[PDB]
Amino acid sequence: AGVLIQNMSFKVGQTLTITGVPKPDSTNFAINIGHSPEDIALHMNPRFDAHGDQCTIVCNSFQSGSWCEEHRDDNFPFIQDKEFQIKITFTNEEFLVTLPDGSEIHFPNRQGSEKYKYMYFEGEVRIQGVEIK
Amino acid sequence: AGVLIQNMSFKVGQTLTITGVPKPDSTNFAINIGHSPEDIALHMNPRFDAHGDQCTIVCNSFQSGSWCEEHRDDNFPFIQDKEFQIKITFTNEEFLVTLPDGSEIHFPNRQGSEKYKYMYFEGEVRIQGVEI
Ligand SMILES: CC(=O)N[C@@H]1[C@@H](O)[C@H](O[C@@H]2O[C@H](CO)[C@H](O)[C@H](O)[C@H]2O)[C@@H](CO)O[C@@H]1O
Ligand SMILES: CC(=O)N[C@@H]1[C@@H](O)[C@H](O[C@@H]2O[C@H](CO)[C@H](O)[C@H](O)[C@H]2O)[C@@H](CO)O[C@@H]1O
């Protein structure tokens, strides 16, 4: 059940910096930001090869047993066993993900909250750094 | 009640860097590194004013339902509402804690595990940074 971080508050206006390395045999991995395992505002799922996607980032939200509408990005600067740094900023309106290569993903903050105290990193990735300021 | 981090891996050779800010009226805060809540290899507990202690760092370990012997340090480079960075290195022998001013604390690795997968931050502090 991967890396679980509880009560490290991520609020509107801060940057979340995630340092990690996909496992050498990674098919995919996910960053889950939300309130609980049943209420995820941002599911960000870089897929090397999983769910029928190859080198695709799938973003979605999960609430009350249900996945919502997928956002898909073909921009994929992740490599098996290579360190990455991802930045996440958010507003009431959306998450702004800055990827390693300086490119960006815009995903709506559908849950609408200004503070999230649940972070869950799942799948074939090692998390070396979580920074919030 | 405070920050719980499970399955982030701390190992001999690695630097653990904690970044945070004690609350303006912080009495104390604690960095817990172990296996479980019942098995704590390093409890590092800077006390502004708690348990009769002012401006003291208390280090200890918790196993089999008991605190072990305290290591107490009068060196206190912490200020309420000011950002700190704390670097922890460990070996089979000891945790080497590097304090914000470049001073160090030696605390024995009484557990002797070589890898820790449970971290719990307690008390009046904002944890801003956890990197291994
Ligand atoms: C084009 C396509 O549909 N693929 C989807 C899958 O992406 C989807 O897989 C789940 O997607 C959610 C996020 O939307 C999580 O990543 C979850 O772990 C995946 O299983 C599947 C199942 O919902 O449906 C489609 O086939
Ligand atoms: C001088 C002295 O020995 N005082 C101790 C207290 O420090 C101690 O309080 C506990 O200390 C542990 C670490 O050793 C934890 O920080 C815990 O939160 C404290 O309650 C008490 C109880 O063990 O014993 C003496 O008073």
Ligand SMILES: [Mg+2]
């Ligand atoms: Mg006293």
Ligand SMILES: [Mg+2]
């Ligand atoms: Mg010796």
